[PDB]
Amino acid sequence: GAAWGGSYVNDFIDRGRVKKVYVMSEAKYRMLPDDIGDWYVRAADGQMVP
Amino acid sequence: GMAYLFVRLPSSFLPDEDQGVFMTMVQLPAGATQERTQKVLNEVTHYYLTKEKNNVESVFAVNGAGAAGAGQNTGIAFVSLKDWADRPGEENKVEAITMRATRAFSQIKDAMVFAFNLPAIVELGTATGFDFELIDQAGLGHEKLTQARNQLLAEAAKHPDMLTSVRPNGLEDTPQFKIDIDQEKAQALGVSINDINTTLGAAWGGSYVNDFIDRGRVKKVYVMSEAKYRMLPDDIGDWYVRAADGQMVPFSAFSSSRWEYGSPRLERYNGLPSMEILGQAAPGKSTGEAMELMEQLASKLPTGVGYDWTGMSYQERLSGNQAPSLYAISLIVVFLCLAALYESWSIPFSVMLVVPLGVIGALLAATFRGLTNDVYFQVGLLTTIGLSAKNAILIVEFAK
Amino acid sequence: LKVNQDGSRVLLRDVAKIELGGENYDIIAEFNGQPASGLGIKLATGANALDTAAAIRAELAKMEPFFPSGLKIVYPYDTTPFVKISIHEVVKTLVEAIILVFLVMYLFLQNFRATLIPTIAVPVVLLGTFAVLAAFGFSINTLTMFGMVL
Amino acid sequence: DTAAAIRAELAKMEPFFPSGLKIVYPYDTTPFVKISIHEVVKTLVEAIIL
Amino acid sequence: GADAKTVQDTVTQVIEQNMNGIDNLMYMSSNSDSTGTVQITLTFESGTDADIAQVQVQNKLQLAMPLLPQEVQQQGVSVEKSSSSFLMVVGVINTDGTMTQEDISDYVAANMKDAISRTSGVGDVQLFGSQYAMRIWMNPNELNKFQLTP
Amino acid sequence: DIAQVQVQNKLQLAMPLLPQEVQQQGVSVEKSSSSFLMVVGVINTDGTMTQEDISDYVAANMKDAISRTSGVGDVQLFGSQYAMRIWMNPNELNKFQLTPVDVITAIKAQNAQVAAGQLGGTPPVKGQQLNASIIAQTRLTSTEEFGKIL
Amino acid sequence: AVFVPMAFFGGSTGAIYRQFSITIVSAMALSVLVALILTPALCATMLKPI
């Protein structure tokens, strides 16, 4: 969800005005359906599954 | 002489009364402990209680609020007086009393004490000069708005001819205590930043946990270190957090501290960082040109600082704006109905001339009483001209 | 709070004072420097006159007898009997105008009938006015009564 | 009303704007309502002298 | 427990952004205290509807309430509409000495304020003192003795 | 106006049954025509700013104020205010055995504001002189700052 | 005619000018009506022959 769709995390301050902080993969990893394979999650032991 | 009596005569909005009660303001430096404030409240009370028994009935005094805000250095008195028939004289009316009080308090060192009468009614404090506000119109911060407001505060208290008592209304950049959690020492020592910040916040600032029940009524449960561990900056070292392994680190390890500076009553007006400004015109001058002078002194200020009038300066009030326009179209309506009753155009002028003969003895009463042209007066004036109208109207309607 | 390898018990009171205290400890009031709490009471835009001020004494008459030993009110602040000797000393003035004019009348219309004529003519024309005042929303304030005086 | 208010808030903003920042007004159901009513005064006048 | 700025960014700023399309308004005054308080006042035309002007804000106050700290709506936000001038102040004094001031404050806060405040037209009651509250005053020497934090 | 809140009574008869994710953003409730009134465009003339800058300058200096003016029932911005953008790389996230979660959490961790009481606050030990606020972890303000997160 | 255009108008201030214009034009009409209702009548039944 965060990778492909972004995520609003918390807010920051930008010259005495509060604004957002979003987090989201570079566009070089979400254009193609093959790019799902490039993503790794850390399994309970320690190893990372794609 | 009518017109001249009319412009030599000053202009109130509504007379203050002796409303039976009045108040007193107490403001210390900061940080200033609560106890010090209490010392000065004891003083102030000792006055209204020893040096005024014949007039005072009750002083209700409160360490903890002000008409600016809460603070340990905020203090206020609620004074009620013995009945009017029981203090006969001017010596014993609000004016003289709050006067000699303010004059007497004047004394106290490092304690700003001033006592005042309640300005007439409700939140109709829309008199007494002005209320000016600087506006951070760019990205400037608190520093540059401090300094810019100082440039103003400065350059205007060097014009004591149509502008005086020019101070900020707020509270003042008291020093603060910075704590710095170098995060890496916290991960390396195995301590939850959550745990750190939690314990710091609860220890030194309290924490509402959940609610309990106290004789069939629900109330709070707070949690907070004994006062013997939060008076001194050294006491941060006495606090331990349980590291991930099991060992307990003191803050001494992963924190670094130091003193700094910054406001305790940050202000905004209409979105942006603002600071609000106070004071009057100057004993021969009106609020209007005073305002202009402020608008002009403001002009010479750094790029990005704007200004705005709120409060009593938004509105602007009464006689001198468009109230003689009211007297005027009222007069036009009158000469109209008189051209209706006489069916002339001249003949009503025999009743128009009847007017100055009344404003003359009105205005006379005014300046010769120390009094001054206000709402009460102006309705007296209206009534005047209306009655004289009646008189003349009847004589000439008789004659024709 | 925790039990030990010792088998020892650690209780809350073992690491803290427990005590019925206050949510906040920054408000300390006194009345003639005797300690004393109270209520400071505000008014909601569009209110409602000596109404609300009577209502206070409602809710409170309702409270005075379940109060503990030696708990007694005082009233250190009152924009109330101001609004009460304000309006009173207007009735007074109306009255005064009436008899003063009764006697200025008597000094020219030297008979108790011609004199009693503009007498009756005065309350009527007042009284009525209040009826018209209700009829447009204006209440018997200080200003209204000064209207009735001028 | 509201259309004047816009030019209120904005007259209030025009001078703290950065270098080379300038408005334009690509849309305006305003001076329509302004030559509408004007060309009515005109007609009233005309009826009168005719 | 908050500092001015902490509050100012975290709360004040974050309501202010979300205050709009509230009718007939003139301006928005915004204080932010080192006692961890904030306060925001909106002003409307003279003669304007107190009540609609009253919620219209709080439509918006809860267009943001889930963007405030847990810690802040655990306490809870209030929304008044009221004069700043009091009306009266009623003080409570015990006469024998049988109760301190904190007791008195509590007895009122738990028997008197609720009821008075519940009466119409009474737009804010400010208590001079504080209702009770269970107070757990922790000791650090003894917390660490048993390897415990807050 | 009544038709306006009457909905939002109900909108918050359900708001806690919507995602965290959805009232983190926040729900809005307008009452307004769909036809615009005017559209005011902002263009830089030298080229000194892109469109994203322009959009931001307005979103942070112009929209708030215009929108705060009565009768203005919805402002739709043509662009978007700024926002700190952390564009993650997956090759490098897995290189260090990291997912997104760890980024998310290092951020809630290191970009925040905490509230941490005072020095010599109430209640105090009698005989104290000093009374100041404590300041702690305070929000971030620069890109670099976000860069150097641990 | 003297009292009415004082109910006009502006501010926090003019509120008060309403509080008299009305309160006194009222007594006007009441007085002058009485003046042709009650006064002439009671100045007929109660005056003593000259």
PDB file of C-alpha atoms in Angstrom, chain E:
ATOM      1  CA  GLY E   1       2.852  19.431  30.002  1.00  0.00           C
ATOM      2  CA  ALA E   2       3.385  21.229  26.687  1.00  0.00           C
ATOM      3  CA  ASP E   3       5.522  24.190  25.760  1.00  0.00           C
ATOM      4  CA  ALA E   4       4.159  27.160  23.780  1.00  0.00           C
ATOM      5  CA  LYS E   5       5.545  26.138  20.400  1.00  0.00           C
ATOM      6  CA  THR E   6       4.821  22.402  20.796  1.00  0.00           C
ATOM      7  CA  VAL E   7       1.153  23.329  21.305  1.00  0.00           C
ATOM      8  CA  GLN E   8       1.286  26.038  18.667  1.00  0.00           C
ATOM      9  CA  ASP E   9       2.384  23.872  15.786  1.00  0.00           C
ATOM     10  CA  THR E  10       0.717  20.643  16.936  1.00  0.00           C
ATOM     11  CA  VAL E  11      -2.721  22.087  17.790  1.00  0.00           C
ATOM     12  CA  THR E  12      -3.183  25.774  17.029  1.00  0.00           C
ATOM     13  CA  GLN E  13      -1.772  25.706  13.545  1.00  0.00           C
ATOM     14  CA  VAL E  14      -3.667  22.572  12.821  1.00  0.00           C
ATOM     15  CA  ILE E  15      -7.100  23.921  13.751  1.00  0.00           C
ATOM     16  CA  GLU E  16      -6.402  27.244  12.037  1.00  0.00           C
ATOM     17  CA  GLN E  17      -5.764  25.614   8.735  1.00  0.00           C
ATOM     18  CA  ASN E  18      -9.187  23.967   8.957  1.00  0.00           C
ATOM     19  CA  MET E  19     -11.130  27.036   9.948  1.00  0.00           C
ATOM     20  CA  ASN E  20     -13.037  28.254   6.882  1.00  0.00           C
ATOM     21  CA  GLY E  21     -16.363  28.631   5.090  1.00  0.00           C
ATOM     22  CA  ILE E  22     -17.741  29.769   8.417  1.00  0.00           C
ATOM     23  CA  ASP E  23     -20.088  32.657   7.529  1.00  0.00           C
ATOM     24  CA  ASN E  24     -20.200  36.370   8.439  1.00  0.00           C
ATOM     25  CA  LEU E  25     -16.776  36.301  10.103  1.00  0.00           C
ATOM     26  CA  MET E  26     -14.388  39.253  10.780  1.00  0.00           C
ATOM     27  CA  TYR E  27     -11.219  37.656  12.249  1.00  0.00           C
ATOM     28  CA  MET E  28      -9.441  34.928  14.193  1.00  0.00           C
ATOM     29  CA  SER E  29      -7.332  35.678  17.363  1.00  0.00           C
ATOM     30  CA  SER E  30      -4.975  32.911  18.435  1.00  0.00           C
ATOM     31  CA  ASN E  31      -3.136  32.485  21.750  1.00  0.00           C
ATOM     32  CA  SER E  32      -0.671  29.684  22.604  1.00  0.00           C
ATOM     33  CA  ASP E  33       0.632  29.383  26.154  1.00  0.00           C
ATOM     34  CA  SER E  34       3.647  27.829  27.853  1.00  0.00           C
ATOM     35  CA  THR E  35       1.162  26.291  30.219  1.00  0.00           C
ATOM     36  CA  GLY E  36       0.066  24.155  27.307  1.00  0.00           C
ATOM     37  CA  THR E  37      -3.077  26.026  26.530  1.00  0.00           C
ATOM     38  CA  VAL E  38      -4.396  27.402  23.272  1.00  0.00           C
ATOM     39  CA  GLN E  39      -7.355  29.539  22.593  1.00  0.00           C
ATOM     40  CA  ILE E  40      -8.954  30.736  19.392  1.00  0.00           C
ATOM     41  CA  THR E  41     -11.628  33.351  19.019  1.00  0.00           C
ATOM     42  CA  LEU E  42     -13.787  34.090  16.004  1.00  0.00           C
ATOM     43  CA  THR E  43     -15.709  37.289  15.634  1.00  0.00           C
ATOM     44  CA  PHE E  44     -18.956  37.877  13.739  1.00  0.00           C
ATOM     45  CA  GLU E  45     -21.104  40.834  12.625  1.00  0.00           C
ATOM     46  CA  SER E  46     -22.987  42.656  15.303  1.00  0.00           C
ATOM     47  CA  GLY E  47     -26.585  41.393  15.270  1.00  0.00           C
ATOM     48  CA  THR E  48     -25.532  38.008  13.884  1.00  0.00           C
ATOM     49  CA  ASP E  49     -27.086  34.692  14.882  1.00  0.00           C
ATOM     50  CA  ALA E  50     -25.248  33.483  17.959  1.00  0.00           C
ATOM     51  CA  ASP E  51     -26.255  29.832  17.574  1.00  0.00           C
ATOM     52  CA  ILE E  52     -25.555  29.082  13.900  1.00  0.00           C
ATOM     53  CA  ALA E  53     -22.358  31.038  14.159  1.00  0.00           C
ATOM     54  CA  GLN E  54     -21.814  28.830  17.185  1.00  0.00           C
ATOM     55  CA  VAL E  55     -21.778  25.350  15.618  1.00  0.00           C
ATOM     56  CA  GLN E  56     -20.611  26.375  12.109  1.00  0.00           C
ATOM     57  CA  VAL E  57     -17.140  26.525  13.655  1.00  0.00           C
ATOM     58  CA  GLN E  58     -17.482  23.108  15.312  1.00  0.00           C
ATOM     59  CA  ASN E  59     -18.535  21.511  12.023  1.00  0.00           C
ATOM     60  CA  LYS E  60     -14.953  22.360  11.135  1.00  0.00           C
ATOM     61  CA  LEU E  61     -13.467  21.694  14.625  1.00  0.00           C
ATOM     62  CA  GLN E  62     -14.279  18.033  13.852  1.00  0.00           C
ATOM     63  CA  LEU E  63     -12.792  18.137  10.367  1.00  0.00           C
ATOM     64  CA  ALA E  64      -9.512  18.065  12.160  1.00  0.00           C
ATOM     65  CA  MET E  65     -10.077  16.598  15.634  1.00  0.00           C
ATOM     66  CA  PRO E  66      -8.535  13.273  14.600  1.00  0.00           C
ATOM     67  CA  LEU E  67      -5.388  15.183  13.547  1.00  0.00           C
ATOM     68  CA  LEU E  68      -4.790  16.411  17.094  1.00  0.00           C
ATOM     69  CA  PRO E  69      -2.830  14.361  19.630  1.00  0.00           C
ATOM     70  CA  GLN E  70      -4.357  11.489  21.489  1.00  0.00           C
ATOM     71  CA  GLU E  71      -3.281  13.431  24.523  1.00  0.00           C
ATOM     72  CA  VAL E  72      -5.333  16.485  23.537  1.00  0.00           C
ATOM     73  CA  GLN E  73      -8.793  14.981  22.766  1.00  0.00           C
ATOM     74  CA  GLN E  74      -8.291  12.655  25.740  1.00  0.00           C
ATOM     75  CA  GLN E  75      -8.690  15.911  27.701  1.00  0.00           C
ATOM     76  CA  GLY E  76     -11.138  17.254  25.150  1.00  0.00           C
ATOM     77  CA  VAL E  77     -11.759  20.436  23.207  1.00  0.00           C
ATOM     78  CA  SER E  78     -14.365  23.026  24.267  1.00  0.00           C
ATOM     79  CA  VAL E  79     -16.353  25.534  22.142  1.00  0.00           C
ATOM     80  CA  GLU E  80     -17.918  28.576  23.880  1.00  0.00           C
ATOM     81  CA  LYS E  81     -19.748  31.734  22.754  1.00  0.00           C
ATOM     82  CA  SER E  82     -19.648  34.292  25.509  1.00  0.00           C
ATOM     83  CA  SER E  83     -18.649  37.705  26.888  1.00  0.00           C
ATOM     84  CA  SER E  84     -15.192  38.021  28.532  1.00  0.00           C
ATOM     85  CA  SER E  85     -16.542  40.254  31.253  1.00  0.00           C
ATOM     86  CA  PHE E  86     -17.848  38.108  34.149  1.00  0.00           C
ATOM     87  CA  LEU E  87     -21.381  38.741  35.542  1.00  0.00           C
ATOM     88  CA  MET E  88     -20.780  37.882  39.163  1.00  0.00           C
ATOM     89  CA  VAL E  89     -18.394  35.850  41.229  1.00  0.00           C
ATOM     90  CA  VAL E  90     -19.696  33.774  44.035  1.00  0.00           C
ATOM     91  CA  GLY E  91     -17.197  32.770  46.677  1.00  0.00           C
ATOM     92  CA  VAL E  92     -17.430  29.856  49.092  1.00  0.00           C
ATOM     93  CA  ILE E  93     -15.775  30.081  52.547  1.00  0.00           C
ATOM     94  CA  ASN E  94     -15.866  27.585  55.408  1.00  0.00           C
ATOM     95  CA  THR E  95     -16.298  29.324  58.722  1.00  0.00           C
ATOM     96  CA  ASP E  96     -14.985  27.031  61.527  1.00  0.00           C
ATOM     97  CA  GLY E  97     -11.859  26.066  59.543  1.00  0.00           C
ATOM     98  CA  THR E  98     -13.166  22.494  59.194  1.00  0.00           C
ATOM     99  CA  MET E  99     -12.054  22.418  55.491  1.00  0.00           C
ATOM    100  CA  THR E 100      -9.017  23.654  53.544  1.00  0.00           C
ATOM    101  CA  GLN E 101      -9.372  25.447  50.189  1.00  0.00           C
ATOM    102  CA  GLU E 102      -8.775  22.298  48.076  1.00  0.00           C
ATOM    103  CA  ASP E 103     -11.667  20.590  49.822  1.00  0.00           C
ATOM    104  CA  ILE E 104     -13.902  23.582  49.221  1.00  0.00           C
ATOM    105  CA  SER E 105     -12.921  23.724  45.580  1.00  0.00           C
ATOM    106  CA  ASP E 106     -13.702  20.017  45.292  1.00  0.00           C
ATOM    107  CA  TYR E 107     -17.053  20.205  47.025  1.00  0.00           C
ATOM    108  CA  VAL E 108     -18.110  22.883  44.631  1.00  0.00           C
ATOM    109  CA  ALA E 109     -16.587  21.197  41.581  1.00  0.00           C
ATOM    110  CA  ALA E 110     -18.544  18.115  42.420  1.00  0.00           C
ATOM    111  CA  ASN E 111     -21.751  19.675  43.772  1.00  0.00           C
ATOM    112  CA  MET E 112     -22.104  23.231  42.608  1.00  0.00           C
ATOM    113  CA  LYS E 113     -20.447  23.907  39.227  1.00  0.00           C
ATOM    114  CA  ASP E 114     -22.197  21.193  37.248  1.00  0.00           C
ATOM    115  CA  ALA E 115     -25.706  22.501  38.142  1.00  0.00           C
ATOM    116  CA  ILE E 116     -25.019  26.272  37.802  1.00  0.00           C
ATOM    117  CA  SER E 117     -23.319  25.587  34.474  1.00  0.00           C
ATOM    118  CA  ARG E 118     -26.272  23.528  33.290  1.00  0.00           C
ATOM    119  CA  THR E 119     -28.523  26.604  33.526  1.00  0.00           C
ATOM    120  CA  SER E 120     -29.215  28.353  30.152  1.00  0.00           C
ATOM    121  CA  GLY E 121     -27.499  31.607  29.090  1.00  0.00           C
ATOM    122  CA  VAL E 122     -24.475  30.699  31.283  1.00  0.00           C
ATOM    123  CA  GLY E 123     -21.779  30.615  28.567  1.00  0.00           C
ATOM    124  CA  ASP E 124     -18.737  29.638  30.661  1.00  0.00           C
ATOM    125  CA  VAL E 125     -18.112  28.872  34.316  1.00  0.00           C
ATOM    126  CA  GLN E 126     -14.460  29.325  35.376  1.00  0.00           C
ATOM    127  CA  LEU E 127     -13.736  27.509  38.662  1.00  0.00           C
ATOM    128  CA  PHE E 128     -11.390  29.079  41.204  1.00  0.00           C
ATOM    129  CA  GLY E 129      -9.564  25.964  42.176  1.00  0.00           C
ATOM    130  CA  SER E 130      -9.826  22.346  41.045  1.00  0.00           C
ATOM    131  CA  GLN E 131     -12.035  19.273  41.510  1.00  0.00           C
ATOM    132  CA  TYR E 132     -10.267  16.364  43.179  1.00  0.00           C
ATOM    133  CA  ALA E 133      -8.218  13.766  41.318  1.00  0.00           C
ATOM    134  CA  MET E 134      -6.321  10.660  42.436  1.00  0.00           C
ATOM    135  CA  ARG E 135      -2.649  11.715  42.567  1.00  0.00           C
ATOM    136  CA  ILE E 136       0.083   9.144  42.198  1.00  0.00           C
ATOM    137  CA  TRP E 137       3.303  10.991  42.997  1.00  0.00           C
ATOM    138  CA  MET E 138       6.087   8.777  41.822  1.00  0.00           C
ATOM    139  CA  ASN E 139       9.569   8.485  43.421  1.00  0.00           C
ATOM    140  CA  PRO E 140      12.488   7.792  41.026  1.00  0.00           C
ATOM    141  CA  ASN E 141      15.002   6.435  43.546  1.00  0.00           C
ATOM    142  CA  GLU E 142      12.493   3.770  44.443  1.00  0.00           C
ATOM    143  CA  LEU E 143      11.302   3.183  40.890  1.00  0.00           C
ATOM    144  CA  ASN E 144      14.833   2.288  39.754  1.00  0.00           C
ATOM    145  CA  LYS E 145      15.417   0.290  42.944  1.00  0.00           C
ATOM    146  CA  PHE E 146      12.974  -2.293  41.540  1.00  0.00           C
ATOM    147  CA  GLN E 147      14.119  -1.772  37.943  1.00  0.00           C
ATOM    148  CA  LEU E 148      10.900   0.137  37.028  1.00  0.00           C
ATOM    149  CA  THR E 149      10.078   3.191  34.905  1.00  0.00           C
ATOM    150  CA  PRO E 150       6.842   5.292  34.834  1.00  0.00           C
TER     151      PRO E 150
END
